Design a protein around this ligand. Structure first.
Ligand SMILES: [Cl-]
Ligand SMILES: [Cl-]
Ligand SMILES: [Zn+2]
Ligand SMILES: [Zn+2]
Lengths: 372, 372
C-alpha cells in the first residue's frame, strides 16, 4: 500500500464515497472514527472496535502528552503497539484540549504554554505538536492551529485564522523535515474563519497553496447549532480541493453526519457514542433512548431491532438498564459496543446508498424514522 | 446429563479430582467459581469468563434480591437468560451479606429482617432464601444458615450452629417441596461450629442425617488466619461425607486454595481475583504484583511470563499500569480477565497433578516459587 491515496468511487450531488489507502490499512469513506481519549477507546478492546467495522480511530494528543507521555510511548514502540491497534490512527494536534481542559494558558505567536489538568507545566507549538504526533507514530497528523470560539467577532476570527495559516505552514515544514514521518504518514490542514465566508475562502486558499493530504473544516460544532453549521458547510466545503478528503472535526449526532455528508464531508469523529453510551444513551434507528428510563426495566427486546451488533444479538434492554443503573462496568462495555456498531452501520448505509445513487432517498427515509 | 452426579476420578492423600455433572454442564473439580456480585462477573462478558476456563460461576442472592429483584429476574426468564451465562450457577443464600452489608437487622428463629443498603425493608428466612434461589433458577442452591463471627465463644458458636442445623432442615424441606427445583437443581448444606472440633462434628452429623448433594465448610476465612483455617480444615473435612463435594466458601488466595485442596476441598469462590484485579493486583507464578507500582511503567513483559491468557498474549505490564493509574475501564477488564484466567490455570494444574499422583510435589514447587 501507498503512504496515502484517496480515491472517489462514486458521487451523488456533493456526497462522495471511496477509500483512503495507507500503509496500515484501507479507510472506507465516509468514515466515522471512534475516539481513543488516551490510548484506549473507552471500555472496548481494539478487537471489539474493529469488529464493529471501524477502519481508523482518533487519538487525543493532549491527554497522551500528559500521561503516559509521548517520549515514553515512543520508547515502548509507539501508540499502535502500546494499545494494540494496528490499523490507521489519526491524532489531533492537542491545541483544542489545551484551551478547553488546561489551566494557566499563555498564548503567543510561538505556541501555547499551559499547566496540566497535576499542575505540571508544558508547551505546545506547531513544531512540538508535529513532533509529539511523530513520537506516537500517528498515520494522519493534524496541523496545529489556534481555535476560534463561537461567537467570534470578524476581527478576532480573522486574526485567529491568519495565525492558524501561519501555523499550518510551520506544521507542513516540521512534518516534511522528518523523513520517516514524511514518507509514512499523512498531514491534514484545518480551515478556520468562524462563520464568515470571506475568511473561510482566504483560509481554504492558504491551505491549498501550502498543500495537504486532506482538509478539515475546523471551528464548527462549538455552539452554533445545526442550521448554522450546515449554512457554513454549504459554502465552506466547496472551497476545499475536491480530490482530497474533507474532515469535519468533532461531529456528531447521526443527523449531523448525514447532513454533513450531503455537503461533501468524508470523515467524522465524536465522543458522543462512547461518552453518551457510558451515560445510558443508546442510538436506534427510531432515535436515541436513555436505557436508564424505567420503561426499559422489563423490556426483553435488544437495544435496536435491526442492529447486527453482538450486544443486540445476546442481551436485552432490561439487562443493560439494570447494569447501567447499578454502575456496572459491563453496562459501559455493552452500551459502547452497540453505539459504535450503530455508528458504523450508519456509515455503511451511507456508503452503499451513495454507491447506488440513492443517498438522497436514504437521508429522507433516515430522518423520517429517526425523528418520528 | 443427570440433575447431579459427583464422580471422583483420582485421589492423592486427602486431595481428589473429578467431575460434577449437572443439566447445564460439567464442573471439573477442584473448581474455582468466579463471583458474579449482581448478575455480572464484573468487567467481563460471560463468553470471556468461559474462555478463561470457568465451568460454573457464583451469584450473590442478597444483591439480586434488592436489585433487580428475584421476581423480576424470574419474569424475565431467570438469571442465566438475563445475564447470558448458560452453564451452572451456584447461588449463596443471602445470609452472610445481610449481616455484613445491610442495616436495621433483626434476627430470630424465623429468619432475619433488614433494611437495604435504599433503606427499603426486606425479610429472609430458610424458606424465602430457597424461593429466591428458585426464582433466579440456580443450579446449586445453598441452605440458609446463621453465620458465626470470629472469634466466637463456645456457647455462641454452639447456639448459632444449632440454629443453622434447624435451618438446614427447613432449607431441605423447602427445596424438596418445589418439584421443579428438586428435580433440576442441587442443594448444599453448610457445616458450622467455629474452630471447635466437637461442634464441627455435631454439625457434620446433623447435615449428613438430613442429606445434601454437597457440603460446605462455613465460618472460615473470617479473620482467623491461614494456620488456624488449615487446623480447622484438618479435622473438619474428614467429618463430611467422602462421596460428595466439599465446598470452602470465600477462599481465597492461591496458597489457601492449594492447602485446602491438600485437606480435601473440591470447590472455591472468592472476589479476590476480580475485586483486587480492578484495584491493580495481578497474580503471577512468582507471587502477586501491584501493577500501579512505578517499576512497571516501562515493563514490556506480560503480566505473567507463562500465562496463556489473551491479556498476556497481547498487552504489556506498561500498558496495563497506565490504564489502571488512569482509571480506564479497559484496565479493569484486562486485569480481571488475566486474574480469573490465572486462577483457572491454577485449578487445572491442581487437577492434572492429582490425576498424575504428583500433587504433593506440585504444591511444594508452587510455594517455593510463589513465595520466593
Ligand atoms: Cl469517550
Ligand atoms: Cl468482584
Ligand atoms: Zn446493537
Ligand atoms: Zn494472563
Amino acid at each position: 500500500r501507498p503512504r496515502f491515496s484517496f480515491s472517489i468511487a462514486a458521487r451523488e450531488g456533493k456526497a462522495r464515497t471511496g477509500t483512503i489507502e495507507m500503509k496500515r490499512g484501507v479507510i472506507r469513506t465516509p468514515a466515522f472514527m471512534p475516539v481513543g481519549t488516551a490510548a484506549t477507546v473507552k471500555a472496548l478492546k481494539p478487537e471489539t472496535v474493529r469488529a464493529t467495522g471501524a477502519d481508523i480511530i482518533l487519538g487525543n494528543t493532549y491527554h497522551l502528552m500528559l500521561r503516559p507521555g509521548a517520549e515514553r510511548i515512543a520508547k515502548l514502540g509507539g501508540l499502535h503497539s502500546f494499545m494494540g491497534w494496528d490499523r490507521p490512527i489519526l491524532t489531533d494536534s492537542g491545541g483544542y484540549q489545551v484551551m478547553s481542559l488546561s489551566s494557566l494558558t499563555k498564548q503567543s505567536e510561538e505556541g501555547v504554554t499551559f499547566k496540566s489538568h497535576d499542575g505540571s507545566r508544558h508547551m505546545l507549538s506547531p513544531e512540538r505538536s508535529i513532533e509529539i504526533q511523530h513520537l506516537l507514530g500517528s498515520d494522519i497528523v493534524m496541523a496545529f492551529d489556534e481555535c476560534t470560539p463561537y461567537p467570534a467577532t470578524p476581527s478576532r476570527a480573522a486574526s485567529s485564522m491568519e495565525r492558524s495559516m501561519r501555523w499550518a505552514k510551520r506544521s507542513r515544514d516540521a512534518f516534511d523535515s522528518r523523513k520517516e514521518q514524511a514518507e509514512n504518514a499523512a498531514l491534514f490542514g484545518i480551515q478556520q474563519g468562524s462563520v464568515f465566508e470571506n475568511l473561510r475562502q482566504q483560509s481554504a486558499d492558504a491551505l491549498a497553496e501550502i498543500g495537504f493530504d486532506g482538509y478539515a473544516v475546523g471551528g464548527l460544532a462549538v455552539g452554533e447549532g445545526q442550521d448554522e453549521m450546515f449554512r457554513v458547510l454549504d459554502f465552506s466545503v466547496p472551497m476545499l480541493p475536491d480530490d482530497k478528503p474533507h474532515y469535519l472535526m468533532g461531529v456528531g449526532k447521526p443527523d449531523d453526519i448525514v447532513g454533513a455528508v450531503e455537503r461533501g464531508i468524508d470523515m467524522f469523529d465524536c465522543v458522543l457514542p462512547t461518552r453518551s453510551g457510558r451515560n445510558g444513551q443508546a442510538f436506534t434507528w427510531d432515535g436515541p433512548i436513555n436505557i436508564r428510563n424505567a420503561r426499559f426495566s422489563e423490556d426483553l427486546k435488544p437495544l435496536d431491532s435491526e442492529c447486527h451488533c453482538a450486544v443486540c444479538q445476546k442481551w436485552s434492554r432490561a439487562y443493560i438498564h439494570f447494569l447501567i443503573r447499578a454502575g456496572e462496568i459491563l453496562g459501559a462495555m455493552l452500551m459502547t459496543e452497540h453505539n459504535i456498531a450503530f455508528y458504523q452501520q450508519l456509515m455503511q448505509k451511507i456508503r452503499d446508498s451513495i454507491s447506488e445513487g440513492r443517498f438522497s432517498q436514504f437521508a429522507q427515509d433516515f430522518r423520517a424514522r429517526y425523528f418520528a
